Amino acid sequence: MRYIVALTGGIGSGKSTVANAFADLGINVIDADIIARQVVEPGAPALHAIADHFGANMIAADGTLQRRALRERIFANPEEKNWLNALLHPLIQQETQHQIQQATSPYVLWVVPLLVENSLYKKANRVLVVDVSPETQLKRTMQRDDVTREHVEQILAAQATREARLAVADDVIDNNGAPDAIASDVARLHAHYLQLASQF
Ligand SMILES: CS(=O)(=O)NC(=O)c1cccc(CSc2cccs2)c1
């Protein structure tokens, strides 16, 4: 069982800036969002199974999963939510575990945007939260996605509070400012995690 450090943070926390710094130190980074999207990408067996089970309306114009349609369809249908979890959870867990086993670094960085929201923190040895202000989240998302302020407000209202993230945090890193000093902060975390990984 390779030592797992979960990285989490809200929308617009600039998580890639922190993850890249660990990658630069030779840490294998395993991205939960990339894996989840991969499992249901066009041509993937789980996407075919979802379309067969729920219908062709689950497929968007570009061939990808219509995620809103699926959510609405399984919403308040517990049997179908249980079916969808029984399909996707083993597939995602198996790909995640495969990437962990293939990793060569002394510990891995598991990047999980919805770590708190989905109660997944118990799967990691250590939780690092990327801490940012709501203002920073709002600014970065609006510049990134070309979306309205009110649209980001709704996303923030639905995500975890900062106090909620810290409740499961072992480590916090402020990423409100410029990315310039992050590698220096991460260098210290990295040394600590090599120590923690060695005695785990
Ligand atoms: C929506 S998500 O993209 O935030 N992911 C998930 O819900 C999800 C579901 C099942 C499994 C895993 C990895 S469990 C693990 C396995 C080994 C080390 S850690 C994640």
Short mmCIF file of N, CA, C and O and ligand atoms in Angstrom, two decimals, residues 4 32-33 36 89 92-93 96-97 100 110 112 114 118 123, ligand 1:
data_model
loop_
_atom_site.label_atom_id
_atom_site.label_comp_id
_atom_site.label_asym_id
_atom_site.label_seq_id
_atom_site.Cartn_x
_atom_site.Cartn_y
_atom_site.Cartn_z
N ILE A 4 -0.40 7.63 0.45
CA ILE A 4 -1.26 8.47 -0.37
C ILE A 4 -1.47 9.81 0.33
O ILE A 4 -2.00 9.85 1.45
N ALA A 32 -8.07 12.35 -9.74
CA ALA A 32 -9.36 11.66 -9.65
C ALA A 32 -10.33 12.14 -10.72
O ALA A 32 -11.12 11.34 -11.24
N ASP A 33 -10.30 13.42 -11.07
CA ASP A 33 -11.22 13.93 -12.07
C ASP A 33 -10.89 13.40 -13.46
O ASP A 33 -11.79 13.05 -14.23
N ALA A 36 -12.08 9.76 -13.50
CA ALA A 36 -13.53 9.64 -13.62
C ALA A 36 -13.99 9.98 -15.04
O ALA A 36 -14.87 9.30 -15.59
N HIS A 89 -18.04 2.99 -9.45
CA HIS A 89 -17.12 2.94 -8.32
C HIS A 89 -16.05 1.86 -8.47
O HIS A 89 -14.86 2.17 -8.27
N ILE A 92 -13.61 3.03 -11.32
CA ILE A 92 -12.76 4.15 -10.92
C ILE A 92 -11.73 3.69 -9.90
O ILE A 92 -10.54 4.02 -9.99
N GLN A 93 -12.18 2.92 -8.90
CA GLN A 93 -11.26 2.43 -7.89
C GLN A 93 -10.17 1.56 -8.51
O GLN A 93 -9.00 1.64 -8.12
N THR A 96 -7.70 3.81 -10.38
CA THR A 96 -6.92 4.55 -9.40
C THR A 96 -5.86 3.67 -8.75
O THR A 96 -4.69 4.06 -8.65
N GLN A 97 -6.27 2.49 -8.30
CA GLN A 97 -5.34 1.55 -7.66
C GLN A 97 -4.25 1.10 -8.62
O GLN A 97 -3.10 0.91 -8.22
N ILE A 100 -1.71 3.85 -8.79
CA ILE A 100 -0.91 3.88 -7.56
C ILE A 100 0.15 2.79 -7.59
O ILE A 100 1.30 3.01 -7.21
N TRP A 110 -2.73 12.32 -4.71
CA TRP A 110 -4.04 11.98 -5.25
C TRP A 110 -4.89 13.24 -5.23
O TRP A 110 -5.28 13.71 -4.16
N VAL A 112 -8.06 15.28 -5.56
CA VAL A 112 -9.48 14.94 -5.46
C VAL A 112 -10.29 16.20 -5.15
O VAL A 112 -10.44 16.54 -3.97
N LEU A 114 -13.42 16.80 -4.94
CA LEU A 114 -14.59 16.58 -4.10
C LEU A 114 -14.29 15.65 -2.93
O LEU A 114 -15.14 14.85 -2.50
N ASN A 118 -17.53 14.13 -0.90
CA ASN A 118 -17.82 12.71 -1.06
C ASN A 118 -17.22 11.85 0.05
O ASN A 118 -17.17 10.63 -0.10
N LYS A 123 -9.69 7.57 2.66
CA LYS A 123 -8.91 6.74 1.75
C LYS A 123 -7.46 7.19 1.63
O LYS A 123 -6.66 6.48 1.02
C1 LIG B 1 -16.26 11.53 -8.11
S1 LIG B 1 -14.45 11.45 -7.82
O1 LIG B 1 -13.70 11.56 -9.20
O2 LIG B 1 -14.05 12.46 -6.68
N1 LIG B 1 -14.08 9.83 -7.38
C2 LIG B 1 -14.86 8.91 -6.70
O3 LIG B 1 -15.99 9.15 -6.32
C3 LIG B 1 -14.25 7.58 -6.46
C4 LIG B 1 -15.00 6.42 -6.46
C5 LIG B 1 -14.39 5.20 -6.23
C6 LIG B 1 -13.03 5.15 -6.00
C7 LIG B 1 -12.26 6.30 -6.01
C8 LIG B 1 -10.79 6.16 -5.74
S2 LIG B 1 -10.75 5.12 -4.13
C9 LIG B 1 -9.03 4.61 -3.92
C10 LIG B 1 -8.49 3.44 -4.26
C11 LIG B 1 -7.08 3.33 -3.95
C12 LIG B 1 -6.58 4.42 -3.36
S3 LIG B 1 -7.82 5.70 -3.15
C13 LIG B 1 -12.87 7.52 -6.23
#
